[PDB]
CSV table of N, CA and C in Angstrom, one decimal:
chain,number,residue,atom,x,y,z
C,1180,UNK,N,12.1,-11.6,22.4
C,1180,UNK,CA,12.4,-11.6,20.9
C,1180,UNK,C,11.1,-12.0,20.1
C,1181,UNK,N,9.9,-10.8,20.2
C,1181,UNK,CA,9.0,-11.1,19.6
C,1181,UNK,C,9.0,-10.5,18.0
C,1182,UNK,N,8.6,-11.8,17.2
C,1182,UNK,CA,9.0,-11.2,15.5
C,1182,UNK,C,7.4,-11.0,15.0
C,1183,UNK,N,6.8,-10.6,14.2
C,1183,UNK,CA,5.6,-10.5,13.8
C,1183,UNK,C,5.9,-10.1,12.2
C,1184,UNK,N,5.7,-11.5,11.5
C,1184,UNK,CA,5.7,-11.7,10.1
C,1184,UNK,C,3.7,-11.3,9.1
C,1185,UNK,N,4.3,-9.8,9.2
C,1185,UNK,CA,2.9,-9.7,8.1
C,1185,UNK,C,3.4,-10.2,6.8
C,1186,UNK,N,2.2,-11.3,5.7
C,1186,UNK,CA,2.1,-11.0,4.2
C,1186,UNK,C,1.3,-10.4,3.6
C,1187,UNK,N,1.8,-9.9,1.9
C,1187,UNK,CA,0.7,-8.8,1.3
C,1187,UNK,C,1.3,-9.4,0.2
C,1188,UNK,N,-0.2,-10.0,-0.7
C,1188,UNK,CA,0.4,-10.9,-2.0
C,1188,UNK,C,1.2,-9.6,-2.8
C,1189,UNK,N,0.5,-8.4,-2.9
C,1189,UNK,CA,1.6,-7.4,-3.7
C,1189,UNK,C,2.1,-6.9,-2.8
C,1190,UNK,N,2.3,-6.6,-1.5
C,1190,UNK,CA,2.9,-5.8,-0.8
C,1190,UNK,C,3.5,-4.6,-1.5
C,1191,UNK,N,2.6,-3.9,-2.7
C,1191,UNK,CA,3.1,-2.5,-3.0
C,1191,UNK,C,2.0,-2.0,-2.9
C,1192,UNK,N,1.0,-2.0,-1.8
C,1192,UNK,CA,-0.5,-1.0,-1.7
C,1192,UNK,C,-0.6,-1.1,0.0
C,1193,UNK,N,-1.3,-2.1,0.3
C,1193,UNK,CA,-1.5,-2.0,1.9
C,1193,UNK,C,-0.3,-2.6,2.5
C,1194,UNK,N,0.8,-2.8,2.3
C,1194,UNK,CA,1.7,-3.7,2.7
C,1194,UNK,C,3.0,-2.6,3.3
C,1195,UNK,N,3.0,-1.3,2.3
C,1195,UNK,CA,3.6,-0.5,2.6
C,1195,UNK,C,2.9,0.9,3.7
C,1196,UNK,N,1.6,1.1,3.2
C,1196,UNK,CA,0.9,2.0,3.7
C,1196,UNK,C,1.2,1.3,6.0
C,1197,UNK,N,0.3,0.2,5.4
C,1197,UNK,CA,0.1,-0.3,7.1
C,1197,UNK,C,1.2,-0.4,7.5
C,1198,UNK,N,2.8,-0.5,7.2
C,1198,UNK,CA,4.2,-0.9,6.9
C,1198,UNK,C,4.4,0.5,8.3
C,1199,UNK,N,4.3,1.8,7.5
C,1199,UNK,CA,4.4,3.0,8.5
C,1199,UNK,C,3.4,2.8,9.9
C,1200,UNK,N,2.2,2.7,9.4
C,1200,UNK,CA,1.4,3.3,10.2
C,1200,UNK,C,1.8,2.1,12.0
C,1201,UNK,N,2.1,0.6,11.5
C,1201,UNK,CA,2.5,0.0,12.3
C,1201,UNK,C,3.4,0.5,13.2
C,1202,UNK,N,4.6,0.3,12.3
C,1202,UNK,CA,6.1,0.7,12.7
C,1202,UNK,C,5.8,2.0,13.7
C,1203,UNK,N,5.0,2.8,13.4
C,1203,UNK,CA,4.5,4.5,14.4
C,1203,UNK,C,4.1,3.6,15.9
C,1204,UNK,N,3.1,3.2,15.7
C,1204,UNK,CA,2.7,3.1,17.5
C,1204,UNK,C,3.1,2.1,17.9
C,1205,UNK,N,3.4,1.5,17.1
C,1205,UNK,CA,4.6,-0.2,18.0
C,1205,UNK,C,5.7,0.6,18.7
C,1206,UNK,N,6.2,1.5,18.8
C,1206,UNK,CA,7.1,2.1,18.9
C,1206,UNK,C,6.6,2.5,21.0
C,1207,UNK,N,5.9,2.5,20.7
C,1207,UNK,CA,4.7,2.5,22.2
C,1207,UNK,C,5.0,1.8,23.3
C,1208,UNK,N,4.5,0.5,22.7
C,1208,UNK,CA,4.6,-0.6,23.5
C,1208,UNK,C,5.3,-2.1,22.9
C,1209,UNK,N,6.2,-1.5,22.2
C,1209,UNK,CA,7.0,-2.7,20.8
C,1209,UNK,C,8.2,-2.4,20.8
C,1210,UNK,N,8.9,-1.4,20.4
C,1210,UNK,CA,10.0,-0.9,20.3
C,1210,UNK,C,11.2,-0.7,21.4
C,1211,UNK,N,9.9,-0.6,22.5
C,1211,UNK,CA,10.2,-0.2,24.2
C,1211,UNK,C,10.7,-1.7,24.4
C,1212,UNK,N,10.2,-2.9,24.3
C,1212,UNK,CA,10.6,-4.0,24.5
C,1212,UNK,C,11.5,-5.1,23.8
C,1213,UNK,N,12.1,-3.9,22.6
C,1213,UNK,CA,12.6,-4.4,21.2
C,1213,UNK,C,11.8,-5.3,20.4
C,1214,UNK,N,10.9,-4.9,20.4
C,1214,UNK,CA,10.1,-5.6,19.2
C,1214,UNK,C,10.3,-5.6,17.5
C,1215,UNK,N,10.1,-6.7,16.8
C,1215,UNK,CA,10.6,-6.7,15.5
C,1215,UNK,C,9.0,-7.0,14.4
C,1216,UNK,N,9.3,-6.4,13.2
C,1216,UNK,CA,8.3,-6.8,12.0
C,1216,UNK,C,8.9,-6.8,10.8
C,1217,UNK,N,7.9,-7.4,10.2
C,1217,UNK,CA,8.5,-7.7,8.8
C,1217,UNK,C,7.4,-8.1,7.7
C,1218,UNK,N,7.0,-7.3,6.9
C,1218,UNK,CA,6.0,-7.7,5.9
C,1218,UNK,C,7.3,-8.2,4.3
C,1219,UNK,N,6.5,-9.1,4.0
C,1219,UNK,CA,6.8,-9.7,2.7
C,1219,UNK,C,5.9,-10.5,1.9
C,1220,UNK,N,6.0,-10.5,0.8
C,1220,UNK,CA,5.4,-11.0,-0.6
C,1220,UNK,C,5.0,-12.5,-0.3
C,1221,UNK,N,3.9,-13.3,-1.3
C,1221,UNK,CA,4.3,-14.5,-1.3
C,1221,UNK,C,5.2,-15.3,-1.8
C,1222,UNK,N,5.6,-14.5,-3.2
C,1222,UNK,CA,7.0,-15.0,-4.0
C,1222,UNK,C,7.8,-14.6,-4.4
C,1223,UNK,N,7.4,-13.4,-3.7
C,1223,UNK,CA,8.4,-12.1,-3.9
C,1223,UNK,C,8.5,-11.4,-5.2
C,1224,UNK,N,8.0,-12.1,-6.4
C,1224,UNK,CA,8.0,-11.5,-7.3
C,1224,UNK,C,8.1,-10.3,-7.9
C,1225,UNK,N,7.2,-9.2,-7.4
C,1225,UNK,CA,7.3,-8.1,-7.4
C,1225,UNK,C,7.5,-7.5,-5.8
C,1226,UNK,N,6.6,-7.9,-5.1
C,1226,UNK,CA,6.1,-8.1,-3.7
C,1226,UNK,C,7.5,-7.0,-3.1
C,1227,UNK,N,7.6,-5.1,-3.4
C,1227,UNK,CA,8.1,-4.8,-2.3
C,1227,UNK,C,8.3,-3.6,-3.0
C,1228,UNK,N,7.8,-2.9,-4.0
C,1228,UNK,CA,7.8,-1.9,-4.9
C,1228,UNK,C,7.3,-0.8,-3.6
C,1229,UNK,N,5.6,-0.7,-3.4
C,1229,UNK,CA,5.1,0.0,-2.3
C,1229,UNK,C,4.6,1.2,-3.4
C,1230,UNK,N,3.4,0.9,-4.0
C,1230,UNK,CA,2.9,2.1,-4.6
C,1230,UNK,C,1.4,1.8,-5.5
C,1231,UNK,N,0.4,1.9,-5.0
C,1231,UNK,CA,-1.2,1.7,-5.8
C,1231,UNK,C,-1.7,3.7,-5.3
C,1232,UNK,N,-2.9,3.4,-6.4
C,1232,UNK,CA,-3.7,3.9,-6.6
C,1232,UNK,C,-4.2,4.7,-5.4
C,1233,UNK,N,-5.2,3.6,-5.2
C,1233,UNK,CA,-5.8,3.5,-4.1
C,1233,UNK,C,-4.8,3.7,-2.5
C,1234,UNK,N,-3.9,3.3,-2.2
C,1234,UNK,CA,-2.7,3.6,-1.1
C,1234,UNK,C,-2.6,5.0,-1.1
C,1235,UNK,N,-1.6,4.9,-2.2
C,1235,UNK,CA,-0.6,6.2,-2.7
C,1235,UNK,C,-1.6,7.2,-2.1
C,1236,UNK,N,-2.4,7.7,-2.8
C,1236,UNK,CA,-3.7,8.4,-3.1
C,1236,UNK,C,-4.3,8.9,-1.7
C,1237,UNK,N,-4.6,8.0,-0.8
C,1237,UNK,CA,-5.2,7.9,0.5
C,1237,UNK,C,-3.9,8.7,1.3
C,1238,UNK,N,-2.2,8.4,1.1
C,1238,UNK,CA,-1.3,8.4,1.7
C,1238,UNK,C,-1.1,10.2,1.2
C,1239,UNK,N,-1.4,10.2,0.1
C,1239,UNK,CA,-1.3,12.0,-0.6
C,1239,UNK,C,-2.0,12.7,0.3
C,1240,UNK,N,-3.1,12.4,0.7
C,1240,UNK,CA,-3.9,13.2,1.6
C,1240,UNK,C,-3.8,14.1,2.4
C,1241,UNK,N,-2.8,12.7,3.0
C,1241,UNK,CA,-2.1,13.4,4.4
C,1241,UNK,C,-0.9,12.4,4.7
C,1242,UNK,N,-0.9,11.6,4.8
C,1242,UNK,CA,0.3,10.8,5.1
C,1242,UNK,C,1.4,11.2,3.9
C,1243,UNK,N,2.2,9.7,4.1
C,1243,UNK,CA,3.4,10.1,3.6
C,1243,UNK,C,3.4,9.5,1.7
C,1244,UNK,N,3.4,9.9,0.9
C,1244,UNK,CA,3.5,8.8,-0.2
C,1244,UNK,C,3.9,7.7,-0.3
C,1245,UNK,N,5.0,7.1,0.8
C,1245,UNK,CA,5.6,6.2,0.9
C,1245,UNK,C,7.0,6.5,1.5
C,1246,UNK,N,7.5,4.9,1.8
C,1246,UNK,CA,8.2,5.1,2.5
C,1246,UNK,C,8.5,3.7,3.4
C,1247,UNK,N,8.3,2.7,2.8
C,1247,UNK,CA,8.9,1.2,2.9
C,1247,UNK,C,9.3,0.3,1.3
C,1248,UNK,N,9.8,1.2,1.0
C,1248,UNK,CA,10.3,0.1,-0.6
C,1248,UNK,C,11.8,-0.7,-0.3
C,1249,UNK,N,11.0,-1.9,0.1
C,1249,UNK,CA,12.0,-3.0,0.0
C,1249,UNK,C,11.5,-4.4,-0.3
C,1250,UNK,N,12.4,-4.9,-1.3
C,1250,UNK,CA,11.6,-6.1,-2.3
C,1250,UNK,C,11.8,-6.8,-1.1
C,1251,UNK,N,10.5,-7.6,-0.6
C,1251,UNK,CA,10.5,-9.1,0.4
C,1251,UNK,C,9.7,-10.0,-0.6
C,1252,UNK,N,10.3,-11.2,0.0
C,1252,UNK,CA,9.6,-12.5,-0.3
C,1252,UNK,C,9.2,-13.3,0.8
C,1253,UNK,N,8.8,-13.5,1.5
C,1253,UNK,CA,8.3,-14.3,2.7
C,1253,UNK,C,8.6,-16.0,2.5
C,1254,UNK,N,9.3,-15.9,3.0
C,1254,UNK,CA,9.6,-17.5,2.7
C,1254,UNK,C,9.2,-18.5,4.0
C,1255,UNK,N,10.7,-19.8,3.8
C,1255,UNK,CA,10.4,-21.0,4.9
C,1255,UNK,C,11.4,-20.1,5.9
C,1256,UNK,N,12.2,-19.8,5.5
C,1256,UNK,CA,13.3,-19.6,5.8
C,1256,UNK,C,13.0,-18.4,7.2
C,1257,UNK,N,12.6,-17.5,6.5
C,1257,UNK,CA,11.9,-15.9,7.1
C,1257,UNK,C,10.4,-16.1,8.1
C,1258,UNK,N,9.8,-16.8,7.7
C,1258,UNK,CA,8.8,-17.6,8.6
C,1258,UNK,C,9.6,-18.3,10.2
C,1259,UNK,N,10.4,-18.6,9.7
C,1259,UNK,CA,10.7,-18.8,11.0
C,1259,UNK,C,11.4,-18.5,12.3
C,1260,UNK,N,11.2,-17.4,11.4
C,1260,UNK,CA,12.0,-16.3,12.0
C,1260,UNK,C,11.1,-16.1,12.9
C,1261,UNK,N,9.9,-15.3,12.8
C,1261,UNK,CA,8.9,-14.5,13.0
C,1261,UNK,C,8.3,-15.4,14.0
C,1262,UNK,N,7.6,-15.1,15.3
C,1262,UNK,CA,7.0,-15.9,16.4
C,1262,UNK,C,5.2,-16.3,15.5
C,1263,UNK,N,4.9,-15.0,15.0
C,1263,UNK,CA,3.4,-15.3,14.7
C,1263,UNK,C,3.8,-14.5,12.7
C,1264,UNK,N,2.7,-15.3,11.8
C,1264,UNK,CA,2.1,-15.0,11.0
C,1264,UNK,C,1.0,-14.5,10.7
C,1265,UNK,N,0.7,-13.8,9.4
C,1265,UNK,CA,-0.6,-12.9,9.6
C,1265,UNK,C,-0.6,-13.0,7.6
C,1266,UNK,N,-2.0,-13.1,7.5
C,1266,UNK,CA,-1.9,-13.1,5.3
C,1266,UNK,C,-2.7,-12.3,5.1
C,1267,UNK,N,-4.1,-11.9,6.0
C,1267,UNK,CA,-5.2,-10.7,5.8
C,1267,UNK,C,-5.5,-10.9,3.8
C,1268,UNK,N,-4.8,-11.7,3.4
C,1268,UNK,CA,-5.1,-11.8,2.0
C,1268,UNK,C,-6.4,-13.4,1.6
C,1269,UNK,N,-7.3,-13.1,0.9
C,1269,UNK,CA,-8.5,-14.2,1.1
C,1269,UNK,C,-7.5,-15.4,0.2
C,1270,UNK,N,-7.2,-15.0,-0.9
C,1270,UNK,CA,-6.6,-16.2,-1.6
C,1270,UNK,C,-4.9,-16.4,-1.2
C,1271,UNK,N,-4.2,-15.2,-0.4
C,1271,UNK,CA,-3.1,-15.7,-0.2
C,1271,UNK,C,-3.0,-16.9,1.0
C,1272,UNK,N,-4.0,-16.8,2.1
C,1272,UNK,CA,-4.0,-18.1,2.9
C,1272,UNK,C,-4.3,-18.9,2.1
C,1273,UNK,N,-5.3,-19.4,1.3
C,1273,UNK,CA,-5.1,-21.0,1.1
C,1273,UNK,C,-4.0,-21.3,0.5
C,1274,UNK,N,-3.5,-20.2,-0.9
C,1274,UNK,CA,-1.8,-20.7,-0.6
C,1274,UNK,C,-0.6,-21.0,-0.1
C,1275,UNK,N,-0.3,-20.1,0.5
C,1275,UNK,CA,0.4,-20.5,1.8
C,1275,UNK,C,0.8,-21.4,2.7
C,1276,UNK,N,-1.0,-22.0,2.8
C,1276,UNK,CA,-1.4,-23.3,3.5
C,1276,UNK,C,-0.6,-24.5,3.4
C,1277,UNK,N,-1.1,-24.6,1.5
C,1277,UNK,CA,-0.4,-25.9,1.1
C,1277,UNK,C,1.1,-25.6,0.4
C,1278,UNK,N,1.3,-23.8,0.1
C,1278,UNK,CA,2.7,-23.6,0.2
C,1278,UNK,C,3.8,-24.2,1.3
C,1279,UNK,N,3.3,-24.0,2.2
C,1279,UNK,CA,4.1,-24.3,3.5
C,1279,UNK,C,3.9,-25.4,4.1
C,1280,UNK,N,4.4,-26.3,5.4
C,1280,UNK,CA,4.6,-26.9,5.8
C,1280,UNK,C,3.3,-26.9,7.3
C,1281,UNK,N,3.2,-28.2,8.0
C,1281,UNK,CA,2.1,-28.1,8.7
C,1281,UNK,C,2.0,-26.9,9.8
C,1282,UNK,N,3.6,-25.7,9.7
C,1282,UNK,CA,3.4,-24.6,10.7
C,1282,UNK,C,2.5,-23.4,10.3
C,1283,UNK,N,2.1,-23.7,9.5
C,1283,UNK,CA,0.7,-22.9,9.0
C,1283,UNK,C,0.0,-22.1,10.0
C,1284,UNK,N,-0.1,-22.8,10.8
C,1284,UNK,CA,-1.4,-23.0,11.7
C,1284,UNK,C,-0.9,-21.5,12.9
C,1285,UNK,N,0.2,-20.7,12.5
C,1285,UNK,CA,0.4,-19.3,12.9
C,1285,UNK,C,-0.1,-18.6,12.2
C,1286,UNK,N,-0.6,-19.0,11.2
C,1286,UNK,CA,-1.1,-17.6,10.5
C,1286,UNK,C,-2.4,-17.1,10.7
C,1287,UNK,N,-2.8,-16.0,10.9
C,1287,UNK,CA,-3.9,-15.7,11.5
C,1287,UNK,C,-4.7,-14.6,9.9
C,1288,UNK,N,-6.1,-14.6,9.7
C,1288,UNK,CA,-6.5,-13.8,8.6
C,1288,UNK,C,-7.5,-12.8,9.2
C,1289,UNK,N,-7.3,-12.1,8.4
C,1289,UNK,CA,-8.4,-10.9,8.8
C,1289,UNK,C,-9.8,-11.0,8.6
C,1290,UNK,N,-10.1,-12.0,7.9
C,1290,UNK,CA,-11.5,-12.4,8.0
C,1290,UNK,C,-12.4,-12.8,9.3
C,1291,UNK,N,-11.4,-12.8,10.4
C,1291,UNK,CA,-11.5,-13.1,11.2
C,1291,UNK,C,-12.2,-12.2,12.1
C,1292,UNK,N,-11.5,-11.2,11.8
C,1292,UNK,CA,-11.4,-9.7,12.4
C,1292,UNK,C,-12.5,-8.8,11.9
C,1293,UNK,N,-12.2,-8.3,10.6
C,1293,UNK,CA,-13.1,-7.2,10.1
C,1293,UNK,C,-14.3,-8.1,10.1
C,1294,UNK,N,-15.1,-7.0,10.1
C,1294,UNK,CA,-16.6,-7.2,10.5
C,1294,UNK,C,-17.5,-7.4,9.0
C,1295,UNK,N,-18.2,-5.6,8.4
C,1295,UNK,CA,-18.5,-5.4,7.9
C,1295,UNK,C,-17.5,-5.5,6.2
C,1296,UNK,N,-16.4,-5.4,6.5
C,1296,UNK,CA,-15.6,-5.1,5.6
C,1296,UNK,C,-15.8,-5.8,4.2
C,1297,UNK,N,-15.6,-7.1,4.4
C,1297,UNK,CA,-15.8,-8.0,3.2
C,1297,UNK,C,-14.8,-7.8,2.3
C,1298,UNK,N,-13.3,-7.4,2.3
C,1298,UNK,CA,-12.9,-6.9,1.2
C,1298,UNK,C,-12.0,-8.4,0.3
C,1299,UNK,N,-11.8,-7.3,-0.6
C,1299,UNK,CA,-10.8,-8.7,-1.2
C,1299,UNK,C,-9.3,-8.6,-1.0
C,1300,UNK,N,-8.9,-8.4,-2.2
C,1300,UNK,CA,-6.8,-8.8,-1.8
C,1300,UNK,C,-6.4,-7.4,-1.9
C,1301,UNK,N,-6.4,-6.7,-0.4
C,1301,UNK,CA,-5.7,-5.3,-1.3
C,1301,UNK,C,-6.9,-4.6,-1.0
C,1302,UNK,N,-7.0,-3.3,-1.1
C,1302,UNK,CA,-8.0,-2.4,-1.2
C,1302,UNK,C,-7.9,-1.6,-2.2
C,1303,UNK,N,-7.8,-0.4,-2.6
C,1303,UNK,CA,-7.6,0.4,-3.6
C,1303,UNK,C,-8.5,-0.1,-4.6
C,1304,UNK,N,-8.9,1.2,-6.2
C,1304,UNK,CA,-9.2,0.8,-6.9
C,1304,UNK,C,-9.6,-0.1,-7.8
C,1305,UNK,N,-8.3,-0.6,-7.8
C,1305,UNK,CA,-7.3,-1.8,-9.0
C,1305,UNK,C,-8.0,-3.3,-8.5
C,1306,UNK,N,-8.4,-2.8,-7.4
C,1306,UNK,CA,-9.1,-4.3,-6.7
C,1306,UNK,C,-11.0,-4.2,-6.3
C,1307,UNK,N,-10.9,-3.3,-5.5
C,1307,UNK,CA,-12.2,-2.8,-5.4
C,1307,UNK,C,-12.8,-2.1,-6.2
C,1308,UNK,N,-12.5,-0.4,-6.3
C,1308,UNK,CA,-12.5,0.5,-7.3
C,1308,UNK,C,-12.8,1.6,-6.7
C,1309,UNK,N,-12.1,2.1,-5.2
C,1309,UNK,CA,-12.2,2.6,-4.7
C,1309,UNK,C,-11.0,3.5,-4.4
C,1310,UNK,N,-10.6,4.5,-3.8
C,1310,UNK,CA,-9.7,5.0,-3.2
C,1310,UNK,C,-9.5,5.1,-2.0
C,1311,UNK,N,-10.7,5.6,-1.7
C,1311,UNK,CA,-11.2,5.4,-0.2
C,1311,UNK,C,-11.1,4.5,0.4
C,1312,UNK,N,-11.4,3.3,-0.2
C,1312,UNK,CA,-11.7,1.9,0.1
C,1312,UNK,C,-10.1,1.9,1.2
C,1313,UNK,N,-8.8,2.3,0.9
C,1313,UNK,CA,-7.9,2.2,1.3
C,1313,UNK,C,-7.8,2.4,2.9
C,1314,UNK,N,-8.6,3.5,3.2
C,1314,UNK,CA,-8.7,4.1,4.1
C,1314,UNK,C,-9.4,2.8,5.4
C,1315,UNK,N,-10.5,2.9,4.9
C,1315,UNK,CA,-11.6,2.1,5.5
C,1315,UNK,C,-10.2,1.0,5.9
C,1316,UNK,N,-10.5,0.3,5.2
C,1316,UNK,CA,-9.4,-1.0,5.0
C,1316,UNK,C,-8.3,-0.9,6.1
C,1317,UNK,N,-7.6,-0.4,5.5
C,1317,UNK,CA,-6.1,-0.3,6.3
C,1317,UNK,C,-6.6,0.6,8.0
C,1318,UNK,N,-7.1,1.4,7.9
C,1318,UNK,CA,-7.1,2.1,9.1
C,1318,UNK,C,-7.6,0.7,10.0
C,1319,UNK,N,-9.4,0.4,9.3
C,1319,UNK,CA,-9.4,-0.4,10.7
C,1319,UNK,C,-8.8,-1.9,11.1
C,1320,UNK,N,-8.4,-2.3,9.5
C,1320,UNK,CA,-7.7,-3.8,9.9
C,1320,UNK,C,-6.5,-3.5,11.0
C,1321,UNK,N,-5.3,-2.8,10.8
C,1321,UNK,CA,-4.4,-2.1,11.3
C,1321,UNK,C,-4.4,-1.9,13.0
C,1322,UNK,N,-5.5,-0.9,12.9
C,1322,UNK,CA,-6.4,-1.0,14.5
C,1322,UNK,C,-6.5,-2.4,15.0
C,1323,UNK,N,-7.9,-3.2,14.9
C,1323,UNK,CA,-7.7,-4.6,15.2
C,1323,UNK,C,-6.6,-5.2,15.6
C,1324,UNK,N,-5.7,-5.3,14.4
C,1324,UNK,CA,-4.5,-6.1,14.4
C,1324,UNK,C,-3.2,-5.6,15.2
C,1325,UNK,N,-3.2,-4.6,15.5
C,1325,UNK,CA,-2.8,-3.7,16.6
C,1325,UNK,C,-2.7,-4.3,17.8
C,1326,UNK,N,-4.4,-4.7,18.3
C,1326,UNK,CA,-5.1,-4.6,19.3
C,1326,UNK,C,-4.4,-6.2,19.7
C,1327,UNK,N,-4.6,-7.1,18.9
C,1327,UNK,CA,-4.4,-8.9,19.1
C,1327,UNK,C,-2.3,-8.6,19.4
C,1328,UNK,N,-2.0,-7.8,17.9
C,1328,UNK,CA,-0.8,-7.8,18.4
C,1328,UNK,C,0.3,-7.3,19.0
C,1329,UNK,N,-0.6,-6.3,19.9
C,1329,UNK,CA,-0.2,-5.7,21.2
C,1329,UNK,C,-0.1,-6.7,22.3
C,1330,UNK,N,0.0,-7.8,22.6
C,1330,UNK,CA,-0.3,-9.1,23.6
C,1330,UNK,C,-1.5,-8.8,24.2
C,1331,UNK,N,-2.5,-9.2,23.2
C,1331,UNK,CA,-3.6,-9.8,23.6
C,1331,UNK,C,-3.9,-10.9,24.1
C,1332,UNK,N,-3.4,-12.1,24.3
C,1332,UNK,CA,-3.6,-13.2,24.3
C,1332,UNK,C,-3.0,-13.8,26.0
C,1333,UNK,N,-2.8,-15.0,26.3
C,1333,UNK,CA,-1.6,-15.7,27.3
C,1333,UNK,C,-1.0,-16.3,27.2
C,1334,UNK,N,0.2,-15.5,27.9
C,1334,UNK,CA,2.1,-16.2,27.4
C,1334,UNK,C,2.1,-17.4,28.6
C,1335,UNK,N,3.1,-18.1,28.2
C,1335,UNK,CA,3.6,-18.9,29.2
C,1335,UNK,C,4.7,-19.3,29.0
């Protein structure tokens, strides 16, 4: 019963895009073992629309326009659901942090990961000013994040 709780302070840009692209190859080596995910918001406030600029745009290309619109809020409750956490957002970890309680310490950020990237909350335009930016972004965080949460690590 492995859960893997992604958040996306808007989760209507990368939250829906990486939403697909995940859900596709987990299906590999995730799906086969019943594996579960779940992205949601920090307060849910809007956090579940699934539609920027910069996404959408990238997703017109070639992918799909979309195709995860469901309002989440990530909570206490939903956290604990999920074996591991993930925020890839720079200012949604330190909220989080002292949002939540001392199980924090699952949450893993992508600052970790990307290299060159440097990005901020979100890719697209509206944030960077890119479209592309989306691409860059999501393809290779997704990759990476893939890679760790394919069982990377040792169970016991």
């Amino acid at each position: 019963m492995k859960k893997i709780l992604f958040i996306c302070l808007g989760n209507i840009c990368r939250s829906p895009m990486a939403e697909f692209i995940m859900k596709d190859l987990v299906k590999k080596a995730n799906l086969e073992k019943e594996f579960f995910i779940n992205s949601a918001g920090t307060s849910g406030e809007h956090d579940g629309e699934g539609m920027h600029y910069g996404t959408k745009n990238k997703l017109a290309q070639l992918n799909i326009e979309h195709k995860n619109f469901t309002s989440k809020k990530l909570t206490q409750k939903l956290c604990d659901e999920s074996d591991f956490l993930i925020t890839m957002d720079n200012s949604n970890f330190k909220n989080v942090l002292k949002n939540f309680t001392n199980t924090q310490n699952k949450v893993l950020k992508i600052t970790d990961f990307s290299p060159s990237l440097n990005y901020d909350e979100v890719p697209d335009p509206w944030y960077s000013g890119n479209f592309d930016e989306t691409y860059k972004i999501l393809s290779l965080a997704c990759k990476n994040l893939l890679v760790f949460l394919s069982k990377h690590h040792h169970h016991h």
